[PDB]
C-alpha cells in the first residue's frame, strides 16, 4: 500500500503527481517504480500544499471554509494511476457517505494517456478533473470526455507551429519520429495532415517506446540514417526520455552533429534530457508553452529542510538522492550511500524552476473559484457551508467550472470555452553553445495565432544554415521537363525536351507547330521569318540587265521598222510575221519581269501565263512562214493572219484550261523546319502542257526548216532560219532538264527564255535593219 500526502480541511481535493519515474521494461507486472523526480515530482507537491495553505489564509476566498488535499503518486504509468483513482473512489463513496471526507475533484495527471483512463473512471462517479499538461486533442470531445478541463491549449496548434517553422526555412524532405501513445500519435497525424496541404514531404515515420531497451534505439538510428544525407531534419513528437535515448545512442554510435532535430514541448526547456549529452543536441529547435516564472514558490521552497518538514513523505529520500549522502539518524537513513550530508547544504544550489508551475497553481485556483462561485450562487443565505450544500454535487460543480473568469498568478485572465481549453502562446527555443563547455537554451522566436515572429539571424548566425533537406533541387530551369519514377512525388528526375519542344506543362513540353520556332527561353512559339530573294541576288541582276539590253534592242528595231513601212526588204517580207515576232519577244521580255518580284495573287499567275504564251505567240509566225515557203517549193495576208490567230486562240485555250485546272494562289513552302520560303501555287501539269505544245511547235519548225534548206532566196534567208531553228532546238533540249535539277528554277527559266528570245532577235532583226540602213 503506497503512501499519500494529506492535509486536513473541510473540503478534500485530490491530485495525481508522478513523484517517481516509470516502471522499467519487464517490471510492469510488479508495478514497482524507479528513481525520484525533482521537477515533475516534489516541486509540484510543495506547490500544491503551499497554494492551498495560502488560499485558506485568504479571507476573501471561501470564508469560514478550510480546504484540504490528498496527493498520490502515479509513476507516469497507467495501471498505478488507475489503482490510485480506485483508492480515491474508495475514500469517497461507501466509506464517506455513510474513512475520510468525499473527494471533490482531482488535478492531473500530466500525460495524455493516463488522463484518459482516469477520466473514464471518474466520469461515472461525477468527479471533475482539471489537467495542466495533457495537451492532446482527443480530450476535447465533450460528448465522450465530459468532466475534463484544461488550463492549456491543445496540440492542434503545436502542429501548426512546427509546420510553419519547417516551411519558413525551406525544408521539404523530413524524417518523422514519435513516441507511442495518445500524445505523439494524434499530434503526428495532425502534423502529417497539415503538412500534406503545404507541400512538405515525410521520409519515413517511426514509433518507439520510452522504456524500450538499449538495443531498440540503435536500430532506430540505423533506419533514420539510412536516408542520409538527404534528410538532415528529424521531426519529433517524442517525450523527453525518448529524446534522451536518441541523444545517448547518437553519442554511442558517433553522430555528433549529423542532423538537426526538431522537437515538441515534450523536451522544450528541460535540462534533464541533455545533461551529460549536450554536445549531440546542439542545434535543435523546441517549442514551449509560454509561462513566466513565479516567485512565491521560489521564496517558499528554498528554506525547506528535511528535519523541519512534517508534510511530505517523499522528502528525505529526495534529499539523499539529490545531495548523494546518507542522513545518520533519520528514519529513512538509506545507508546505501556514503559521505553524509553536512548542515550547510541548501536547495538554492543548482536550482532550476519547473516549466509548468503556473499551470498547476492556476488549476488549483480554478477549482477553488468554481467551488466559491457555486457556493455563493447556490447557498446565498449563509457565508460558509450549509445543509443545502451537503453533500456537494458533481454536475453543479462542472457547470460552475465551465464559466470560470479570473486572473492567474502570472497575471493573465483565465477563461476557457465550452470545450474546456484555455488559450495559450508559444516560444521557439534553440539549444546552442554560448561559450566554451557552456551550453544553453535561448529564446529565438514566438507563436500566437499564426504570427510566427522568429529570428533568422540569431539561428545559424549566418546565411549558411544546415543543408536544406530537399530530395530534388529546383531543376526545372525553364528548358527541362520533370519526370517522376512513380514511387514518390517528393523528388524527381529531369529530362530535357527537344529543341523543337517548348515548355507548356511543369512535367512535359510540347513541340511547336510547323512554321513556328521555339523562342529563346522556350516559353512559346514564334513565326519563322520567310526568306525570298527580292532584289539583292547577283543572278537576278544579271538576268535583269540582259533583259534590259534585249528590250532596248527590240524597241530600237521596232522603231526602225515603224519609221518606214514601205521598203524593198519590207515589201519582200510580210509585216504581219515580223510584227508577230516582235510582239512575242516583247511579251517574253515582259514576262521576265513581274516574276523576280514578291509573289502575289495576280503577279505570279500573269508571269506563268506569259512564259507559256510568249513562245506560242512567237513561233506561230515563223512556222507559218516555213509552211508557206515549203508549199511554194483566205490567201496571202489573210491566210497568214488566219493561221496566226488560230494558233494564238489554241494556245490561249490551252492556257485557260491549264489555270482552270490549277487556280492561282500563293503558298508558304516548308523545305525544312528551320527555313520557310514564299512561292506561288503551280502544278507540274500547268508547266508540262505549254512545254509539250512548244515542243510540238519546235518539231514542226525544225521539220519545215530542214525541208527547204537548198533555196538561197529571200536574201539567203534559209540559212538564217535553219540556224535559228537548230539553236532553238538545242537550247530547248538543254533547258528541259534544268527545271528539275536545282532550287534556282526561276532564274534558270528566266535566263533560258531571255537567251532564246535574244537568239531569234539577233538572227532576224539585224539583217533587215542593215538592209534598211546599209
Amino acid at each position, epitope marked *: *500500500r503506497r*503512501v499519500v500526502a494529506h492535509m486536513p480541511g473541510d473540503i478534500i481535493i485530490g491530485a495525481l503527481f508522478s513523484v517517481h519515474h516509470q516502471p522499467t521494461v519487464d517490471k510492469v507486472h510488479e508495478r514497482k517504480c524507479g528513481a525520484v523526480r525533482e521537477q515533475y515530482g516534489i516541486q509540484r507537491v510543495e506547490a500544491m500544499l503551499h497554494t492551498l495553505e495560502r488560499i485558506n489564509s485568504d479571507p476573501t476566498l471561501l470564508p469560514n471554509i478550510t480546504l484540504g488535499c490528498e496527493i498520490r503518486d502515479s509513476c507516469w504509468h497507467s495501471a498505478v494511476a488507475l489503482e490510485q483513482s480506485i483508492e480515491f473512489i474508495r475514500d469517497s463513496l461507501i466509506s464517506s457517505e455513510e474513512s475520510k471526507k468525499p473527494i471533490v475533484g482531482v488535478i492531473g495527471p500530466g500525460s495524455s494517456s493516463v488522463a484518459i483512463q482516469v477520466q473514464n473512471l471518474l466520469q461515472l462517479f461525477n468527479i471533475p478533473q482539471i489537467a495542466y499538461s495533457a495537451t492532446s486533442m482527443d480530450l476535447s470531445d465533450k460528448t465522450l470526455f465530459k468532466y475534463f478541463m484544461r488550463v492549456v491549449p491543445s496540440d492542434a496548434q503545436q502542429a501548426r507551429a512546427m509546420v510553419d517553422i519547417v516551411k519558413r526555412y525551406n525544408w521539404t524532405y523530413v524524417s518523422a519520429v514519435h513516441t507511442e501513445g495518445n500524445y505523439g500519435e494524434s499530434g503526428m497525424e495532425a502534423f502529417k495532415d497539415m503538412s500534406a496541404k503545404e507541400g512538405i514531404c515525410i521520409a519515413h515515420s517511426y514509433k518507439i517506446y520510452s522504456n524500450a531497451g538499449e538495443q531498440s534505439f540503435d536500430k532506430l538510428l540505423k533506419k533514420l540514417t539510412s536516408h542520409l544525407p538527404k534528410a538532415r531534419v528529424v521531426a519529433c513528437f517524442c517525450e523527453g526520455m525518448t529524446v534522451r535515448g536518441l541523444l545517448m545512442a547518437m553519442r554511442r554510435l558517433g553522430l555528433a552533429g549529423e542532423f538537426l532535430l526538431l522537437g515538441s514541448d515534450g523536451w522544450a526547456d528541460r535540462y534533464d534530457v541533455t545533461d551529460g549529452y549536450q554536445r549531440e543536441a546542439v542545434g535543435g529547435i523546441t517549442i514551449k508553452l509560454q509561462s513566466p516564472d513565479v516567485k512565491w514558490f521560489d521564496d517558499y521552497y528554498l528554506k525547506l529542510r528535511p*528535519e*523541519t*518538514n*512534517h508534510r511530505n*513523505p517523499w522528502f528525505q529520500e529526495f534529499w539523499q538522492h539529490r545531495f548523494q549522502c546518507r*542522513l*545518520e*539518524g*533519520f*528514519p*529513512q*537513513e*538509506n*545507508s*546505501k550511500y556514503n559521505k553524509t550530508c553536512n548542515s550547510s547544504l541548501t536547495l538554492k544550489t543548482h536550482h532550476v524552476q519547473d516549466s509548468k508551475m503556473g499551470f498547476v497553481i492556476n488549476a488549483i485556483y480554478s477549482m477553488a473559484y468554481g467551488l466559491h462561485n457555486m457556493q455563493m450562487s447556490l447557498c446565498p443565505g449563509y457565508a460558509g457551508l450549509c445543509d443545502a450544500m451537503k453533500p456537494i454535487d458533481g454536475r453543479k460543480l462542472l457547470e460552475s467550472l465551465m464559466k470560470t473568469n479570473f486572473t492567474g498568478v502570472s497575471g493573465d485572465t483565465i477563461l476557457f470555452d465550452e470545450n474546456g481549453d484555455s488559450p495559450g502562446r508559444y516560444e521557439i527555443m534553440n539549444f546552442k553553445e554560448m561559450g566554451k563547455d557552456y551550453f544553453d537554451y535561448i529564446n529565438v522566436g514566438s507563436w500566437d495565432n499564426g504570427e510566427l515572429k522568429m529570428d533568422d539571424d540569431e539561428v545559424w548566425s549566418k546565411k549558411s544554415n544546415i543543408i536544406r533537406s530537399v530530395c530534388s533541387e529546383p531543376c526545372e530551369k525553364g528548358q527541362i521537363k520533370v519526370i517522376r519514377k512513380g514511387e514518390v512525388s517528393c523528388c524527381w528526375t529531369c529530362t530535357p525536351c527537344k529543341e523543337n519542344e517548348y515548355v507548356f506543362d511543369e512535367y512535359t513540353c510540347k513541340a511547336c507547330q510547323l512554321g513556328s520556332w521555339p523562342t529563346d527561353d522556350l516559353t512559346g512559339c514564334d513565326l519563322i521569318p520567310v526568306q525570298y530573294l527580292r532584289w539583292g541576288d547577283p543572278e537576278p541582276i544579271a538576268a535583269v540587265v540582259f533583259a534590259c539590253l534585249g528590250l532596248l534592242a527590240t524597241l530600237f528595231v521596232t522603231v526602225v521598222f515603224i519609221i518606214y513601212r514601205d521598203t524593198p526588204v519590207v515589201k519582200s517580207s510580210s509585216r504581219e510575221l515580223c510584227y508577230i515576232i516582235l510582239a512575242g519577244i516583247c511579251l517574253g521580255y515582259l514576262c521576265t519581269f513581274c516574276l523576280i518580284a514578291k509573289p502575289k495573287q495576280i503577279y505570279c499567275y500573269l508571269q506563268r501565263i506569259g512564259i507559256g504564251l510568249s513562245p506560242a505567240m512567237s513561233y506561230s509566225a515563223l512556222v507559218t512562214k516555213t509552211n508557206r515557203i515549203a508549199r511554194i517549193l483566205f490567201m496571202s495576208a489573210c491566210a497568214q493572219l488566219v493561221i496566226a490567230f488560230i494558233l494564238i486562240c489554241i494556245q490561249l485555250g490551252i492556257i485557260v484550261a491549264l489555270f482552270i485546272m490549277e487556280p492561282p494562289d500563293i503558298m508558304h513552302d516548308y523545305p525544312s523546319i528551320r527555313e520557310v520560303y514564299l512561292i506561288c501555287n503551280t502544278t507540274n501539269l500547268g508547266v508540262v502542257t505549254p512545254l509539250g505544245y512548244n515542243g510540238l511547235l519546235i518539231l514542226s519548225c525544225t521539220f519545215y526548216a530542214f525541208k527547204t534548206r537548198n533555196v538561197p532566196a529571200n536574201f539567203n534567208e534559209a540559212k538564217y532560219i535553219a540556224f535559228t531553228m537548230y539553236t532553238t532546238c538545242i537550247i530547248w533540249l538543254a533547258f528541259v532538264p534544268i527545271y528539275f535539277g536545282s532550287n534556282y528554277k526561276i532564274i534558270t527559266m528566266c535566263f533560258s527564255v531571255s537567251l532564246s528570245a535574244t537568239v531569234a532577235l539577233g538572227c532576224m532583226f539585224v539583217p533587215k535593219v542593215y538592209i534598211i540602213l546599209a
Partner: nanobody
Amino acid sequence: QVQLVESGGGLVQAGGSLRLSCAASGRTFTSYAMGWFRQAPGKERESVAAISSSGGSTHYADSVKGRFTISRDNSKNTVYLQMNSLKPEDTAVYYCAAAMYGSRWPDWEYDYWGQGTQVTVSS
C-alpha cells in the same frame, strides 16, 4: 491508523535472555521507523533503541550499548528485539513506537503507541 501489539516479555531470572516481538497491523509497515522505549515506576520515560524504516541502521542507548540486538522482518510484519544478560534495570514496562517524519536521533516525533509488556527481573 494501525495497531501495535507486543509479546514475549515476562518474568525471568537475572542473567537470562529473551525475545520481544512487536507487530503492526495494516500494510504500510515497510515505511515506518520503529523505536523501543522503557518506563519504570517512579521515574520519567527513557529511550532504549531504534531501527530505521528501511533497515540496515541501528541506534542503541549508551546505558544498554553492546549487549542488546534488534532486527526487523517486513514479510511477517514484525520487529524483534533480542535482549540478553537480563540487567536489573530491565524490570519495567516496554513500549513500541512508530515514527516516519522523524529528525536526527533521538528526536523522531513518534505518533503511534503500543500497550507494551512488563518485564520483571529477579535478584
